[PDB]
Write a protein that binds this ligand. Structure first.
Ligand SMILES: Nc1ncnc2c1ncn2[C@@H]1O[C@H](COP(=O)(O)OP(=O)(O)O)[C@@H](O)[C@H]1O
Ligand SMILES: Nc1ncnc2c1ncn2[C@@H]1O[C@H](COP(=O)(O)OP(=O)(O)O)[C@@H](O)[C@H]1O
Ligand SMILES: Nc1ncnc2c1ncn2[C@@H]1O[C@H](COP(=O)(O)OP(=O)(O)O)[C@@H](O)[C@H]1O
Ligand SMILES: Nc1ncnc2c1ncn2[C@@H]1O[C@H](COP(=O)(O)OP(=O)(O)O)[C@@H](O)[C@H]1O
Ligand SMILES: [Mg+2]
Ligand SMILES: [Mg+2]
Lengths: 432, 445, 96, 76, 438, 433
């Protein structure tokens, strides 16, 4: 069937295609060429995996179509799902709700994962009888498939039981430390054959084993999530809505100290990750200035960046800088350069894309498509792959031939041909 | 703390007892004049008798300005407040820039409060009124004391209290065998549950049964609490804990920084002065570090004039690596450090110079020691040669990739070949700029 | 709940470290809204005089044949909100 | 003091968004934000995967006779 | 111990230092020189004290470091706490919460104080015996009796239910010196005349006692309530205004509320209920205001509730913010016609030396005559503020070497360590390529 | 009473034929402008035309605001006069057109008859009736009456802590219950009760009083857009959660127009069209002017008086479009321009004398001539503003009148705009920027 994840521009990339020595293979895990860049990405990935050094910045620079986003996706895939990888675009930090520095702080704190581990003693059973004598004192009877006992209740326990409307046949768990009661379900009996059921009620089997149990919960949350939780009374709702606002710096410092305390106590572990900003040239000078000193924190993740700009103008200024990034930040980062692909590399990438899309092509078709990709662009050839597949299927064919590629080349224009046709009719178009 | 950051090796200013700067001490190398000036500034901060004084650290990028500020913070200690801040932080969607600056100013002024908290813990063993043989008014019984017996792990004491405590005892529903605590400074009884020795395994209460208190019945300790003026200001502007409709609205509504008025700040200042006069609190004026001051606009600088002219302001440290740049918010106005000359007239300028190759090699060795990396002499010389061109940051940033490459290769030290391979793999700013210039047609914009 | 405040949370007793971390002096330097109202009682009595020139009830929506469930739902919502919130608004009675 | 504004509209307008239950799907199967504060990781991960009902158990319980009355407590 | 207020830039200025005829002394109350400007400031101060003319504007204009802010602070200190003095910066009116005109209006109305004077009956005495009898069970009428004592009186008071409740809430005991306001029934404890019984435990350390009040028990005292126009506007704008008095967040106050408040205050002034205490608003660096703010000032100074407005600017013929028009002092000529301009002349050598002497006296720094000469030469060459900073720097350097008097060597040392604008600019020119932009 | 810049302006100084006396009602010149303003005042009093705009144009110091305030004084305190500055439309809460519309409705006033029903007396019985109503007994010096009141009134009585023996005031229209005090008859029972006593009301328990309420259309719009009259929980919630201004819709304004027309038809309301005054109109931007086009073309709008001192100046919001008064020609086609002229030295001396009389200052003839000469150069405003400092100098020296020496000393102490400009030009290298 068709799941929500479908064939995209980088669905064929499963990793960086490196060996144990970080030497890149010619074609492995969906990556072709870019040997030096892939080796550098592997070095950065080992640095990330070690996790010892904080606030390391890497810039993936190169011409458009040279595999910068491909290399970033390869790094993200090679890194386990355990380690956080926040991928944002440069435009996403311009928010009407929070400042640019607040957006960058939230992105940074989303990239550090905190794995929590809480062990709690609980009582778990099905409710048999609740007797309350006169809201002062009472008794509660709980049972399992192998056990049954009666409990003496106090004032607060009685109040909690009455507030939750706990009755007979309900399957409940009680936290010994805090006394909070959550209802798992209710037992099914011949008399509970309801014709309509409420939106929250569900029938579950009576628990087995022993009435007293230990509950171990292990989950991974980010620092930003803990900040949002502790920002306000019901801050966890902002973890869904996103109406976080600007979190106070004092709260963040308190949460950092508490997380360090948990790490010392053995109740939490830190997993520093990666923040990938694609097309960083859209960041303004204020964002770069904030990044300069944000990377200097002890709770700063690895910042991987990617731009395809030459010596251009920094946004928010009138100055020209080698990547659109002020040279002060560029001195804080290592630059990984991607080289343009050759004919062989382009053909191998086209083969991988065709295999990913399940398209059969003849060798002459591959030669023509590689020539087109070199002449126009690699992405144009990738699109022509699917266009030619559609045309071939329309004429009840099974293998894409040169005729299909020529047909889709005539039907769909690249940038150069479209620009030429526009120049032929320049006066027709508006606001030249 | 366990992770190694860029200034993890700076443990303070390497100053002799006479103030002269040692060539290499406390993680700092070179910058002797700047370190001596920073030591003078540290003495100024410790003197606690000056307000609003400003110091600007001016120099080329990568010359130790942030390192010098952090060394100042280390020299002061954790007692002295140190509020780091970048110039980009004044642009907020909730409050105006002047409000952000004022809030950081109040964050830098700290207050240390010392108080003695005396409490009486124990399990109530006895509750006996002390009647008087002559009842006032003739009828009934009159009582002059209420004897409360308190039992702890290592003792038992009896306290003859005021008769008025009977109402508090009844309100708290205190009976025999319950654990209570009485505060001397208030004379109030609070029931912190019942003793656990009277609880059975068949009970289900959670917060009702408490362990018998350890230690002595009479516990007194000195509580030292460090707060800042901004903490009090914010806690009073948006109070938390009330039961009125306004507190409920505050809990419901999204938190938002507000423009705290001069009335509240004056009230807080009066309360702090009263506390100081009473002897409860001692003022601890700290430092506000504003890095990348050039990112402030003309409005922020103008407000900074009045901010620094105040008698409550902390000692502010600026830092700028700009030359004759154009002030933000102005149209073609150039100033020597990106700062208008009016604010430069109000600061003391500390110049940071570039590092000689020997100092660069020393810094590389120190950084390698901090990161737990063993580097050979030939590799160190090659990396210093790499640092003579490019920059110092590039050289200190090639250390960990080279260590990883050596570990993969199976070596416990960085050799020259590893550094050469890392240099081949990663480009610096100048090499990347040369590549971009050589292919300016193929790139975008 | 009171994260990063001079006011400490409600420590159960001296056995908790939070009992010996916060001071009563810091507590007395933070005023709740009720304390602020008590502090400005004379100012409220003497200087609160401005009345709106016009006073109207909120606009009402009328339909000939409305959904018979909307009005009881709105009435129950208003009744519950009033029963939960009116006791908390009593301090503002003199201002109102 | 002024009387309120009486805004009169068509009765059909107030039913514009209303959809009959037989014409709409249950959106509670995608309700993630409603589960917060009510459902725990224990219930989702450990309990429900182990103690989910089956059709066989449900049919057996429904078809079986009523359980015997619970014995009265005896001081022993 | 160090108070919250420490030695600042203008900590030595205790007033303008003028005589009865407003003739400026050469050096008095911290002020040195600026004779003409100080005389103008004294005339303006007399105008403020008279409090009869509304909406007068004065502009203090001069070169940087000529004492404009010093003159403003001297005027503020000479006014005293009775007269309001609202000092703000020009940048502060640009706010995301309110309009520029609203911010300027609030700044003006923070500079006008409304004072209400009324006489109330007050009972002040030492509690001898207090007795309160309450029903054992159920709602009932509490009956009580209170005995109060002065040096010349002793009366036994029969207490009502509400006074009983107030006394119970205040926990009034024997020996407490209490104040009772008959109208409102408020009770304020101001001390204990003697200690409590020693046999009681868990009572704490007894503080110092307070002598019992003398004179009659029920006296008559004058109660003064003073708020500003801004406070009235804020607390009348909405129910939550009293919290907005501390949190800000007032938004934009309706003009109807302000008109009602103006009318009510005029009525009170006619009916002798309240007196208006007009004050001063000081906007430092007024050149940061834009054209709209200046245009608002133009007509806002024409109200009868406007205070005296004092501005400071060090700009010449400069473009007005928000426009492309060059104007003197950055201010439009329409506003420049509504204000009097006070020029500050630069300081001579002797004035600089006297300023340095006053600063050293303020900072408790002892300096030699040769050091004073060198420091004055540095101040003339570089700037006055640089010399002021070098004062403290040399004090610290001298204290480091276990000295007692600041010598020429310390001044040279701090001159070497800390740079002025000129030498920093020279060294930056020497390394122009190393710095980032231009 | 404090003396402001226009405290001497009491009227337009016109005769019965409409011609302008030279010096009358605190006005010295501008005879043509004063006659035009008299015509405008008669137009406002006619209450026939709607949305007629007038522009006062001239250099600064030529008494445009003085003429506007003289028009206001001629109209009287009954006719609304809303003064607004052009810079006030740039609010952070509502759009500029909303501000303009609100000031338009603020300029139209309404005199409406209202009847207030009052229950005032000492409480003798407070019996709840289980939502629980209240049965209350009130007594005065004229009689006694028992009333059954709504549960909201009972809640208000409880909030006021009203108990048997308290003197209370109840307004039946608004349901506003105010407890005034415990009855004076009980002031002797105790010696310290912590109560404020009040005598027994001497009228009837139930009173009906007819009063005239002065409101504007904007007040009705605000009351119906941010309601607070229901005294329910929702009104308090809306007030606390949404305190900012809102963009009132045209539908609400149409409903208010219908309601006010119904009131006027019933004969219990009278409409006073009133005047809106915008002082620094050049501070409006092109969007505001475009909106003002349609607003003035409306048949509901009031009479609007505009002022401007700009010459051929670029309209705000445009790049380089320059118009004669800072006002686009489309709006200038919709206005009647009143031109103010510069004052002769004689008129300046007359104005200085009038201002001196207003401020209670005695000035000699020589001093008056010297100050008029000072005003011939510089400006009239500068010459007028030197009166109070010179008076203070004379008072310090023990003189009860201003002599020429005091004027000379003050002029030496305080510079004018031209002198400061000369100083800045001579020392351009020393001042900042
Ligand atoms: N080395 C590579 N291996 C496989 N696919 C690649 C490689 N380089 C580029 N591509 C493909 O080329 C397309 C464009 O490259 P991408 O990295 O996404 O953008 P750019 O490099 O222009 O920023 C992508 O769909 C990607 O799958
Ligand atoms: N004199 C020094 N001694 C030791 N370490 C230094 C010195 N100067 C710089 N460093 C280190 O080298 C890095 C360069 O950054 P830094 O010079 O602080 O940037 P900036 O010049 O913008 O302050 C920092 O991590 C700092 O810790
Ligand atoms: N005439 C003076 N008398 C005493 N102190 C002065 C005088 N002029 C300037 N100062 C002091 O010199 C310092 C800088 O002067 P300042 O008033 O800030 O200059 P500006 O007028 O540019 O604001 C201030 O601390 C001020 O106290
Ligand atoms: N014809 C006049 N008669 C008397 N006083 C005048 C006259 N014209 C102007 N004034 C006074 O001179 C001052 C300047 O008037 P104003 O109306 O503010 O000028 P403009 O509106 O042209 O800027 C005002 O205080 C006003 O009272
Ligand atoms: Mg890309
Ligand atoms: Mg100044």
């Amino acid at each position: 069937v068709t799941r929500i994840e479908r064939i995209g521009a980088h669905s064929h990339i499963r990793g960086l295609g490196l060996d144990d020595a970080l030497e890149p293979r010619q074609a492995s895990q969906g990556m072709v060429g870019q040997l030096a860049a892939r080796r550098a990405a592997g070095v950065v990935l080992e640095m990330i995996r070690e996790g010892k050094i904080a606030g390391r910045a890497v810039l993936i620079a190169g011409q458009p179509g040279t595999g910068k986003t491909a290399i970033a996706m390869g790094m993200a895939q090679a890194l386990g799902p355990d380690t956080p990888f926040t991928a944002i675009a440069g435009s996403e930090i311009f928010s009407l709700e929070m400042s640019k520095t607040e957006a960058l702080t939230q992105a940074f704190r989303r990239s550090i994962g905190v794995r929590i581990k809480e062990e709690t003693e609980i009582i778990e059973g099905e409710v048999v009888e609740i007797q309350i004598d006169r809201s002062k004192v009472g008794k509660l009877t709980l049972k399992t498939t192998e056990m049954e006992t009666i409990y003496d209740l106090g004032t607060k326990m009685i109040e909690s039981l009455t507030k939750d409307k706990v009755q007979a046949g309900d399957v409940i768990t009680i936290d010994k430390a805090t006394g909070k009661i959550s209802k798992l379900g209710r037992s099914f009996t011949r008399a509970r054959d309801y014709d309509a059921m409420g939106s929250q009620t569900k029938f579950v089997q009576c628990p087995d084993g022993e009435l007293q149990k230990r509950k171990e919960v292990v989950h991974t949350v980010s620092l930003h999530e803990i900040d949002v939780i502790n920002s306000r009374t019901q801050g966890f709702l902002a973890l869904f809505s996103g109406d976080t606002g600007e979190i106070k710096s004092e709260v963040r410092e308190q949460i950092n100290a508490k997380v360090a305390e948990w790490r010392e106590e053995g109740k939490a572990e830190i997993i520093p990750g990666v923040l990938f900003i694609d097309e960083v040239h859209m960041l303004d000078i204020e964002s770069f200035s904030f990044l300069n000193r944000a990377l200097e924190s002890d709770m700063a993740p690895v910042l991987i960046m990617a731009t395809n700009r030459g010596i251009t103008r920094i946004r928010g200024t009138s100055y020209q800088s080698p990547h659109g990034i002020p040279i002060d930040l560029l001195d804080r980062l290592l630059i990984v350069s991607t080289t343009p692909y050759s004919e062989k590399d382009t053909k191998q990438i086209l083969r991988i894309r065709c295999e990913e899309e399940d398209v059969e092509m003849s060798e002459d078709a591959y030669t023509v498509l590689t020539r087109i990709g070199l002449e126009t662009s690699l992405r144009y050839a990738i699109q022509l792959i699917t266009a030619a597949s559609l045309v071939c299927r329309k004429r009840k064919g099974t293998e894409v031939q040169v005729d299909d590629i020529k047909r889709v080349y005539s039907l769909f224009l690249d940038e150069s041909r479209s620009t030429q046709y526009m120049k032929e009719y320049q006066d027709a178009f508006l606001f030249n | 703390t366990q992770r190694i950051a860029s200034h993890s090796h700076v443990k303070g200013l390497g100053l002799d007892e006479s103030g002269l700067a040692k060539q290499a001490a406390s993680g700092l190398v070179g910058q002797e004049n700047a370190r001596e000036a920073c030591g003078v500034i540290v003495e100024l901060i410790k003197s606690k008798k000056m307000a609003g004084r400003a110091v600007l650290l001016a120099g080329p990028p990568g010359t130790g300005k942030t390192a010098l500020a952090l060394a100042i913070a280390q020299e002061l200690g954790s007692k002295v407040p140190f509020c780091p801040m970048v110039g980009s932080e004044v642009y907020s969607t909730e409050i105006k820039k002047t409000e952000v600056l004022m809030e950081n100013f109040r964050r830098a002024i700290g207050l240390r409060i010392k108080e003695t908290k005396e409490v009486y813990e124990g399990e109530v063993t006895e509750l006996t009124p002390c009647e008087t043989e002559n009842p006032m008014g003739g009828y009934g019984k009159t009582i002059s004391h209420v004897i409360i017996g308190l039992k702890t792990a290592k003792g038992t004491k009896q306290l003859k209290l005021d008769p008025s405590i009977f109402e508090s005892l009844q309100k708290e529903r205190v009976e025999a065998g319950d654990v209570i605590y009485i505060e001397a400074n208030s004379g109030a009884v609070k029931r912190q549950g019942r003793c656990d020795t009277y609880a059975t395994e068949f009970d289900l209460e959670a917060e009702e049964y408490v362990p018998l208190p350890k230690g002595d019945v009479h516990k007194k300790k000195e509580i030292i609490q460090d707060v800042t003026l901004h903490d009090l200001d914010v806690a009073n502007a948006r109070p938390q804990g009330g039961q009125d409709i306004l507190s409920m609205m505050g809990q419901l509504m999204k938190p938002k920084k507000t423009e705290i008025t001069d009335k509240l700040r004056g009230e807080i200042n009066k309360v702090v002065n009263k506390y100081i006069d009473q002897g409860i609190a001692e003022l601890v004026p700290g430092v506000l570090f504003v890095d990348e001051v050039h990112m402030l606009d003309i409005e922020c600088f103008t407000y900074l004039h009045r901010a620094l002219e105040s008698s409550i302001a902390p000692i502010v440290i600026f830092a700028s690596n700009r030359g004759n740049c154009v002030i933000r918010g102005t149209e073609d106005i150039t100033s020597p450090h990106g700062i208008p000359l009016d604010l430069l007239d109000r600061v003391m300028i500390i110049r940071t110079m570039l590092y000689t190759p020997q100092e660069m090699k020393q810094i590389i060795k120190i950084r390698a020691q901090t990161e737990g990396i063993n580097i050979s002499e030939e590799a160190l010389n090659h990396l210093g040669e790499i640092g003579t061109k490019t920059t110092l940051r590039y050289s200190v940033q090639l250390l960990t990739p080279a260590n990883l490459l050596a570990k993969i290769n199976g070596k416990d030290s960085i050799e020259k070949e590893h550094v050469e391979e890392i240099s081949e793999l990663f480009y610096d700013a100048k090499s990347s700029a040369k590549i971009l210039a050589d292919q300016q047609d193929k790139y975008m914009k | 709940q009171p994260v990063a405040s001079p006011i400490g949370p409600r420590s159960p007793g001296p056995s908790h470290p939070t009992f010996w971390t916060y001071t009563e002096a810091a507590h007395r330097a933070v005023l709740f809204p009720q304390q602020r109202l008590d502090q400005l009682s004379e100012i409220i009595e003497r200087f609160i005089f401005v009345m709106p020139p016009v006073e109207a009830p909120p606009p009402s929506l009328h339909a000939c044949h409305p959904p018979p469930w909307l009005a009881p739902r709105q009435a129950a919502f208003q009744e519950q909100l009033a029963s939960e919130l009116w006791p908390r608004a009593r301090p503002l009675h003199r201002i109102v | 003091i002024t009387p309120g504004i009486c805004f009169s509209t068509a009765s059909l307008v107030l039913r514009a968004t209303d959809v009959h239950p037989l014409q709409r799907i249950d959106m509670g199967r995608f309700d993630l934000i409603g589960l917060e504060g009510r459902v725990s990781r224990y219930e989702a991960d450990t309990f429900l995967p182990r103690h989910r009902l089956s059709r066989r158990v449900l049919l057996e319980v429904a078809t079986a006779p009523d359980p015997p009355p619970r014995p009265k407590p005896v001081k022993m």
